[PDB]
Amino acid sequence: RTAVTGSQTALLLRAFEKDRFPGIAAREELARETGLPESRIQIWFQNRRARHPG
Amino acid sequence: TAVTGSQTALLLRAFEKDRFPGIAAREELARETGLPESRIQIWFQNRRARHP
DNA sequence: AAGATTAGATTAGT
DNA sequence: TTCTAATCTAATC
């Protein structure tokens, strides 16, 4: 539906750099923080882990 | 970077017969053109968005 | 222009 | 059910 902002990006990375495989509870909280659907958060983490191993 | 005139000409005949070539079709084009497989796929992706 | 890359998303699946 | 791996589209160096 729309590109995400810089702040939303920064927040996901800060989370990403502490819990690379956030569980559903972690993902729902990030959803509320960012104003994104939970499904889009999951996709972000899946793609990010596939694109930045180690 | 930068493909030749001949390589371009060959790709269009293929594009106009198989617009979404699978790995086997794409691998054959690599040997035909002398290009890496990854660049042919990229070529097709760009061509389909710019020349449907 | 046209080649290359990035992000978001979808599908298939041991 | 969540994940990986390919791969597609759209948008952009």
From Swiss-Prot, chain A:
- Look up the domain of life of the source: Eukaryota
Outcome of substituting R51E: Decreased DNA binding affinity
Query: Which residue ranges does the Swiss-Prot or TrEMBL entry mark as DNA-binding?
Result: 1-54
Q: What is the effect of changing N47A?
A: Decreased DNA binding affinity
Family, according to the entry, reads as follows: Belongs to the paired homeobox family.
Quaternary form? Binds DNA as a monomer. Interacts (via C-terminus) with EP300 and CREBBP.
Please report the name of this protein according to its UniProt entry: Double homeobox protein 4
Organism from which the protein derives: Homo sapiens
Tell me what gene encodes this. DUX4
Mapped onto the parent protein, the portion here is: 98 to 151 of 424
From Swiss-Prot, chain B:
Q: Which residues bind DNA?
A: 1-52
* Free-text domain note: The two homeobox domains are arranged in a head-to-head orientation when bound to double-stranded DNA, each domain binding to one of the two DNA strands. Together, the homeobox domains can be considered to bind DNA with the consensus sequence 5'-TAATCTAATCA-3', but due to the head-to-head orientation of the DNA-bound domains, the first homeobox domain binds to the consensus sequence 5'-TAAT-3', and the second homeobox domain binds DNA on the opposite strand, with the consensus sequence 5'-TGAT-3'. Both homeobox domains confer nuclear targeting. The C-terminal region is required for efficient activation of transcription from target promoters. It mediates interaction with EP300 and CREBBP.
* Record note on what altering R50E does: Decreased DNA binding affinity
What is stated as this protein's family in its record?
Belongs to the paired homeobox family.
- Mutating R47E leads to what result? Altered sequence specificity, with increased affinity for the DNA sequence 5'-TAATCTAATTA-3'
Q: What is this protein called?
A: Double homeobox protein 4
This protein's gene is called: DUX4
Q: What else is known?
A: DUX genes are present in 3.3-kilobase elements, a tandem repeat family scattered in the genome found on the short arms of all acrocentric chromosomes as well as on several other chromosomes.
Q: How does it assemble?
A: Binds DNA as a monomer. Interacts (via C-terminus) with EP300 and CREBBP.
Disease connection: Facioscapulohumeral muscular dystrophy 1: A degenerative muscle disease characterized by slowly progressive weakness of the muscles of the face, upper-arm, and shoulder girdle. The onset of symptoms usually occurs in the first or second decade of life. Affected individuals usually present with impairment of upper extremity elevation. This tends to be followed by facial weakness, primarily involving the orbicularis oris and orbicularis oculi muscles.
Where expressed (tissue)?
Isoform 1: Does not seem to be expressed in normal muscle, but is detected in muscle of individuals with FSHD, and also in testis (at protein level). Isoform 1: Does not seem to be expressed in normal muscle, but in muscle of individuals with FSHD, where it may be toxic to cells. Isoform 2: Detected in skeletal muscle, fibroblasts and testis from healthy individuals.
